[PDB]
């Protein structure tokens, strides 16, 4: 069900001192060039579940040329996921199998190691400002981007007429509009990943990156809605989970 309310604080508590460390800026050479010459290889995380479960778990990793978006890597492994799932604390119950397969891969194949990843989630467009997208990023010194699906309602941040206007004037891929939130700051962007998508990703700041930046490659990675990374690792975790079931 849901952790005791002491261990939410603890959970707050390791947040608020990992932040800390999240770097909001670009670090990394290929990120101020205009086509980000230099960028080789893209990672992607994700982790899928088998219905009436809870207990089982897929978790993958992918890394993807770049600008081409072909696999070149792949870890997909089954895990035994404790922690439940609670909005604000996805990192909790993912992230430290996550490190585990970065960790696999330094092992693996070092020089295929990725040079940003894509994280299935937030980055500080969180309730904390530290999603999952930060936790992985701090954890493992990767450049990491978050990306989710809907929009997570902290900050005054509401999926209302108005939020719903502005997705309307969102006309072709690339088109973005910023998330404000009521302190003053910019978390994400709200990004029409696709011509022929009009349900936005909301993309923020995982690690070793700025906003502008993780917004634009994200879109560079999206042949569909979902960016590549992140899709195949969606894709073939899923896969692996049916063929082992
Ligand atoms: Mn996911
Ligand atoms: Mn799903
Ligand atoms: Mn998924």
Same mark, same amino acid.
């Given at each position: ?13 390791? &947040?608020?001192?990992?932040?800390? +460390?999240?770097? %909001? ?7 101020? %060039? ?36 072909? $696999? ?16 604000? #604390? ?63 309602? $902290? ?21 973005? #509009? ?36 993780? $917004? ?6 999206? +042949? ?7 899709? &195949?690792?969606?894709?073939?975790? +899923? ?7």
């Amino acid at each position: 069900e849901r952790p005791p309310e002491e261990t939410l604080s603890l959970w707050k508590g390791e &947040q608020a001192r990992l932040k800390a +460390r999240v770097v %909001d800026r670009d670090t990394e050479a290929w990120q101020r %060039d205009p086509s980000f010459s230099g960028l080789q290889k893209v990672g992607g995380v994700d982790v899928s579940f088998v219905k009436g479960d809870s207990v089982r778990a897929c978790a993958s990793l992918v890394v993807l040329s770049y600008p081409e978006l072909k $696999v070149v890597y792949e870890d997909s492994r089954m895990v035994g996921l404790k922690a439940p799932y609670v909005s604000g #604390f996805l990192a909790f119950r993912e992230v430290p199998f996550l490190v585990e397969l970065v960790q696999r891969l330094q092992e693996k194949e070092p020089d295929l190691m990725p040079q940003v990843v894509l994280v299935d989630g937030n980055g500080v467009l969180h309730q904390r400002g530290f999603g999952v997208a930060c936790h992985l990023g701090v954890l493992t010194e990767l450049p990491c981007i978050g990306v989710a699906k809907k929009l997570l309602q $902290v900050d005054g941040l509401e999926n209302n007429a108005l939020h719903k206007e502005k997705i309307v004037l969102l006309q072709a891929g690339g088109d973005t #509009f910023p998330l404000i939130g009521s302190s003053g700051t910019v978390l994400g962007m709200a990004l029409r990943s696709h011509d022929h998508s009009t349900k936005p990703l909301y993309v923020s700041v995982g690690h070793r990156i700025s906003l502008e930046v993780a $917004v634009r490659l994200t879109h560079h990675c999206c +042949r569909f809605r979902i960016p590549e990374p992140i899709r &195949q690792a969606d894709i073939r975790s +899923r896969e692996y989970i049916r063929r082992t079931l």
